[PDB]
Amino acid sequence: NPFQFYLTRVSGVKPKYNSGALHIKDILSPLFGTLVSSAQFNYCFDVDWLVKQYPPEFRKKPILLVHGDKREAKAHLHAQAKPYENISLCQAKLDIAFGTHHTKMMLLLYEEGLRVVIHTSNLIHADWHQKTQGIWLSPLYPRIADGTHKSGESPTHFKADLISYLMAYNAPSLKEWIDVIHKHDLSETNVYLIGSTPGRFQGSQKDNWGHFRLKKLLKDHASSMPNAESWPVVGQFSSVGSLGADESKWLCSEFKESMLTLGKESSSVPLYLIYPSVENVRTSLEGYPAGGSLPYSIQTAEKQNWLHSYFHKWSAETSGRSNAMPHIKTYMRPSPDFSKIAWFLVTSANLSKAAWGALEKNGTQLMIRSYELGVLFLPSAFGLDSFKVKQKFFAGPMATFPVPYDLPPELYGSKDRPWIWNIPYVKAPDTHGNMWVP
Ligand SMILES: O=P(O)(O)Cc1ccc(Nc2c(-c3ccccc3)nc3cc(-c4ccccc4)ccn23)cc1
């Protein structure tokens, strides 16, 4: 495969469903490269656990933790890291209220080159144990020889775009990583970077981030096909923000409109949203505790009941993962019979305005609250018009894209409800024998 899209290993599926999955210990293994230093961008960290995932021989190499914690939360993270003198921290600035540092990325500097890993998991044991999570593994990028002047740039502009994403932090530890990236050749990269950073973007910057970045890439590097209005949009996520009083406020006005863009010329497009039901969570490998990583609150949900008529169950027989609750987030554009896709995105971004951006100032400004990061797979970047959908995720005819859950998505039944984490479920016990009492 050219795609280098992986799921994380799941404890409690048959070996055939972990063949070609990756655990964090595999990503950090000496087989992937001889580690010199690393940067871990994330939201949540268990530092004691994290250090143990590195090979023993690499555990004293410098590690930078890039986080967004403030006040007592920041103090707690510093206290976690203080025993490890090789660990440095970078607090990403969050100058708009209610934003988070949500990006999940590893920068892995080796004796042999550089690797970038953009993924969906927090750095805690539970996120790598029984969840469905997604990973994009970059190629091993070689160093550009000193005295050689070359760009090291890919046709997708990934090198400059990654440097642009890091430059937005205005952080000295990350300028050091920018200088590392400048010294490497990233020209083999076949994915497009889609980041969000906090800010209010106008004019020459509105297309840099969030859903306007997606829109721009789709305008420039995808083409429209006949009957495009029949090609659905699928969004798949593990958290839901406050989207407004009806679908016209954000979801089906600006967000869907970006997602349905194809090509450069100027809606009945079906919108599928995949989000675990209560029954998905109850019968999951983790049971109700899976719902601690699905933080949809009743205060939010009761303001937007209109949204749940878009919701489809989690189902992943294709990857043996129907009972491994999703923390991956994905967005894609399948054909009307779901046999092909026009593009696929794996990202940290959930279904929220904070992550994707909301237009302000009479549509002239895009405001984003958070840091997010994902990679976009476009057929044109592979010499193709569309991707075939892989019938079985771990099977083997490889310009076929490995979609990790089942198509078509299945609508909630009349008795299903979205998982809402702060109300009790005491009607039926979970796979461990327990109820859920927040
Ligand atoms: O796929 P088929 O045709 O049905 C053939 C088939 C039938 C039964 C199993 N049972 C099974 C499961 C299993 C089962 C059901 C749910 C979850 C996990 N996990 C394992 C792991 C090993 C193992 C042994 C040594 C070293 C490393 C791994 C052996 C068996 N395991 C596996 C395959």
Residue numbers in the entry: 162 to 427, 433 to 562, 566 to 607
Give the exact sentences the study uses for this entry:
Human tyrosyl-DNA phosphodiesterase 1 (TDP1) is a 608 amino acid DNA repair enzyme that processes 3′-DNA end-blocking lesions by hydrolyzing the 3′-phosphate esters. TDP1 is of importance because it can reverse stalled type I topoisomerase (TOP1)-DNA cleavage complexes (TOP1cc′s) by cleaving the phosphodiester bond between the TOP1 Y723 residue and the 3′-phosphate of its DNA substrate (Pommier, 2006; 2009). When acting on TOP1cc′s, the target phosphate ester bond nestles in a well-formed pocket that contains the signature “His-Lys-Asn” (HKN) catalytic residues. As we report herein, we have designed phosphonic acid-containing variants of our previously reported carboxylic acid-containing imidazopyrazine and imidazopyridine inhibitors and we have obtained crystal structures of the catalytic domain of TDP1 (148–608) complexed with a subset of these inhibitors.
In our current work, we obtained X-ray diffraction data from crystals soaked with compounds 3b and 4c at 1.56 Å and 1.58 Å resolution, respectively. Unambiguous electron density for compound 4c was observed in chain B of TDP1 while the active site pocket of chain A had no compound bound. Compound 4c was observed to bind to the active site of TDP1 with the benzylphosphonic acid headgroup nestled at the base of pocket lined with the catalytic residues. Direct hydrogen bonding interactions are observed between the phosphonic acid 03 oxygen and the of the side chain nitrogen atoms of N283 (3.0 Å) and H493 (2.7 Å). Additional binding interactions occur via a network of water-mediated hydrogen bonds between the 03 oxygen of the phosphonic headgroup and water 828 (2.9 Å) with the side chains of K265 (2.6 Å) and H263 (3.2 Å). The 04 oxygen atom of the phosphonic acid headgroup, however, does not hydrogen bond to any of the active site residues. The Y204 side chain stacks against the aryl moiety of compound 4c via a hydrophobic interaction. Additional hydrophobic interactions occur between the side chain of P461 with the phenyl ring of 4c and W590 with the imidazopyridine. In compound 3b, the phosphonic acid headgroup is positioned approximately at the center of the HKN motif while the phosphonic acid of 4c is shifted approximately 2.6 Å (with respect to the phosphate atom) towards the H493 and K495 residues in comparison with 3b. The phosphonic acid of 4c superimposes closely with the hydroxyl group of the Y723 side chain from the bound TOP1-derived peptide that is covalently attached to the vanadate (which mimics the transition state).
